[PDB]
């Protein structure tokens, strides 16, 4: 959390800018599955940077 420099002094602002969220064949879904996009990434030996 960061302070809100312009505005109320008791405001906390979230500024999350990331280009490094990896999706790959070794990462599973919240339900534990690795189907669909994940399976194709595993077969193609590819990973995504979201």
């Amino acid at each position: 959390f960061q302070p809100d420099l312009v505005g109320d002094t008791r405001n906390a602002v979230i500024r999350f800018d990331s280009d490094d969220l990896v999706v790959s064949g070794d990462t599973t879904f919240i339900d534990g599955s690795a189907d669909g996009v994940i399976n194709d990434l595993k077969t193609a030996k590819l990973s995504l940077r979201l």
């Binding site: 809100d4 420099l5 312009v6 505005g7 109320d8 002094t9 008791r10």
Partner: protein
């Protein structure tokens, strides 16, 4: 059929047990930010000789 049927009172509690707080005060502050920009210059050219 003419009778007084109802009434309402202007009764209040004595807040000596401080059951009620009423309105609240809190101290606050706001911040404003004013950055100063640069502007294009004006130039007077002259020869170096």
């Amino acid at each position: 059929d003419l009778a007084v049927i109802g009434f309402e009172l202007d009764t209040r509690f004595t807040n000596t047990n401080r059951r009620q707080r009423g309105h609240l005060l809190q101290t606050r502050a706001l911040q404003f930010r004013h950055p100063i920009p640069m502007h294009a210059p004006v130039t007077l050219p002259m020869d170096t000789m």
